[PDB]
Amino acid sequence: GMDELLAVLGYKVRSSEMADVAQKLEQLEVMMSNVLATETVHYNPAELYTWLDSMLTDL
């Protein structure tokens, strides 16, 4: 159920969660424009949903 066009690019995202990932990306941009990289190195960069969710928390 993963988006195969993103999977080939190294990213793992469920097709049904694409909109939720899009929402998180914008929420993260918002927080950045109101402000981190140290703790980022610990997160799995391929799992976008969890990566973004983890970043949002750190902010």
């Binding site: 066009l5 190294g10 694409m18 899009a22 990306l25 190195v41």
Partner: protein, 338 residues
């Protein structure tokens, strides 16, 4: 202030997620003081190894072109016909079979600071080029700014061009010559232009250049830069940052490396330059510079084919889910096999 609803209206949602993810990650990698978080950058980037095993009719292998600088390039080739076993390390340089076998020397994008030949987005693009153009692709892992600024990237491209041109196994049967085409997106397009200039001044004849949303600029703030700033993934602020990281200390954007048609740049009038295919995304904020580039070539009497995709954004060629990608791949094939 932040509202990204507008950019979502022009691209498929998965494309939006891919480009926006890079946008946010790169914001973190670029530091206000001009430094770059290289360690995190290389950790976040999604990479893939070469693979001698044919996949979708394409296989690849890495080559060390120059040790002193550890310059690598990845070679992509169509699967060998009548292959009983996969290629061993001694079967990778098998002479190309065909009267005319185009070889595309590709330079990835990333504004001179991001990505590698082994980044998944570019390994995938190169594999698609091999299958859609029926040719060999050599992707250069050129050195990146700010650690290795101008002219390092161009020097790497020159070294790669000579390596390619001197491969006996890449010669076409017709004229016993290697049919070379330079290609690149973003900064890679800028590199292709500059490598082509150096080629003409030597004994290497490039058959054509393919520039996808080539990265060019100048001191002036064009109308597209002012009107599209921050609306479609790119900001003038980050553009300025990458130019400053790449250009020599104390230089400005009228340096020929930034603006190929700068008063400081050598005239292309009556010069031995290859035909060009220039693709310009209408929603790329540096659209005006790219259009000016295509016009510069035409004015200099050079052969130039302009593809202005008015509703396309940067990165439209990373996913095969839009007409811009399809139309462009069709023209690239026609261009290389013409």
């Amino acid at each position: 202030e932040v509202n990204l609803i507008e950019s979502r209206t022009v691209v498929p949602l998965n494309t939006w997620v891919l480009i926006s993810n890079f946008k946010v990650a790169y914001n973190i990698l670029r530091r206000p003081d001009g430094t770059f978080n290289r360690h995190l950058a290389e950790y976040l980037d999604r990479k893939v190894t070469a693979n001698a095993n044919p996949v979708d009719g394409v296989f690849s292998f890495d080559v060390l072109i120059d040790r002193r600088i550890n310059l690598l390039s990845r070679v992509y080739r169509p699967a060998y016909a009548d292959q009983e076993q996969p290629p061993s390390i001694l079967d990778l340089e098998k002479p190309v079979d065909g009267d005319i076998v185009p070889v595309i020397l590709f330079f990835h994008g990333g504004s001179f600071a991001h990505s590698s030949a082994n980044s998944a987005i570019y390994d995938t693009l190169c594999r698609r080029l091999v299958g859609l153009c029926k040719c060999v692709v050599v992707s250069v892992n050129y050195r990146r700014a700010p650690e290795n600024p101008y002219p390092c990237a161009y020097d790497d491209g020159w070294i790669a061009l000579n390596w390619v041109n001197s491969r006996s196994w890449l010669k076409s049967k017709k004229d016993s010559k290697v049919h070379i085409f330079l290609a690149g997106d973003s900064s890679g397009g800028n590199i292709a232009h500059n490598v082509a200039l150096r080629a003409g001044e030597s004994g290497i004849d490039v058959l054509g250049n393919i520039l996808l949303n080539p990265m060019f600029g100048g001191n002036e703030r064009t109308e597209s830069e002012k009107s599209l700033d921050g609306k479609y993934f790119v900001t003038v602020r980050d553009r300025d940052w990458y130019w400053k990281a790449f250009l020599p200390e104390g230089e400005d954007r009228e340096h020929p490396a930034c603006n190929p048609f700068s008063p400081r740049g050598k005239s292309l009038e009556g010069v031995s330059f290859p035909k060009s295919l220039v693709v310009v995304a209408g929603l790329d904020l540096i659209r005006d510079w790219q259009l000016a580039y295509a016009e510069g070539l035409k004015k200099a009497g050079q052969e130039v084919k302009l593809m202005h995709l008015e509703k396309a954004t940067v990165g439209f060629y990373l996913l095969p889910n839009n007409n811009h990608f399809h139309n462009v791949m069709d023209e690239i094939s026609a261009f290389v096999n013409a």
